[PDB]
Amino acid sequence: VLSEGEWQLVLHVWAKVEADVAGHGQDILIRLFKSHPETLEKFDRFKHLKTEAEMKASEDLKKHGVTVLTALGAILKKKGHHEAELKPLAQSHATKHKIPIKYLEFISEAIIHVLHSRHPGDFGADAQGAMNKALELYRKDIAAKYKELGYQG
Ligand code: HEM
Numbered sequence: 001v002l003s004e005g006e007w008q009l010v011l012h013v014w015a016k017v018e019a020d021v022a023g024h025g026q027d028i029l030i031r032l033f034k035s036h037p038e039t040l041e042k043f044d045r046f047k048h049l050k051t052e053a054e055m056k057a058s059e060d061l062k063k064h065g066v067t068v069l070t071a072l073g074a075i076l077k078k079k080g081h082h083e084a085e086l087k088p089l090a091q092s093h094a095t096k097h098k099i100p101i102k103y104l105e106f107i108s109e110a111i112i113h114v115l116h117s118r119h120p121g122d123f124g125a126d127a128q129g130a131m132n133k134a135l136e137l138y139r140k141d142i143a144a145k146y147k148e149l150g151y152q153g
Contacts, residue, residue, distance in 0.1 A: 002137070006130035007079045013115055013122045013131065014076055017069065024114060025065020030055050032110040039103055072111075076134060086138060090145035100153035101143050108135040 002010070017024045030052055033040045040047050046064075049055045071089060075082045093099045112131060115123045123131075146153065 002080060002130060002133050006133060009127040009130040010076055010134050011079075013119055013127050014073060016119050016122055017115065018073065021066050021069050022062050024118065025069050026056055026062055027114045027117070028107070028110045029061060029065050029068075031113055032107050035110065036103070036106045039106060042097060042099060042103070075138060080137065082138070082141075086141055087145060090142045091149060093142070094146045094149045094151035094153070098151070098153060101139060101146070104139050104142060108132075108139065111135065
C-alpha cells in the first residue's frame, strides 16, 4: 500500500508526463522494443518497424502509446482503488494479447527509464521508489487476474 506522500509524488511526475503524452508514449515503447526485442514480436502491426526513426514516424505507434499511457494514468489517479480500471486490461492482456508478467516488468523498467531521462528533478529516489511501488502493485493485481482467467504467462 502506497502512502499518501508516495501517491503525491507519482501524480506530480505524472502531470509532467501529461504535458506531452505522445512523446512519452513513443519513448517508452521504443525503449521497450530496444531493450527487449522479443516484445516487439507481440505487436503484429509494428513488428516491421526497424529503426528508431521509423518508430518515431509511425502515427499508429504514436496513437497506441497514448492509449497505453491514458489507461495507466487513469489507474494511477485512483491511488490504489483501481479494480474496475485494471481488470479489463488484465482480461485483454491475458486472453487476447498474451503478455507474460516478465513483459510487464520490462515495460515498467521502460517507464522508469523514460521518466528519469525527461524529469530528473521530479523523479528522484523518492519519486522513483513510489512509481516502482505503484507499477509493482499493478503487476501483482494483473497476475492474480491472469490466473483467475487460466492464463499462466
Ligand atoms: C503498463 C502496461 C500496459 C498498459 C497500461 C497497456 C494498455 C493497453 C491498452 C489500453 C490497450 C488497448 C486496449 C486493449 O487491447 O486492452 C493495449 C493493447 C495492447 N497491448 Fe498493452 N499495455 C501494457 C503492457 C503491454 C505490454 C508489455 C505488451 C507487449 C509486450 C502489450 C501488448 C499490447 C498489444 C499487442 C495490444 C494490442 C495493440 C494493438 O493492436 O492496437 N501491452 N494495451
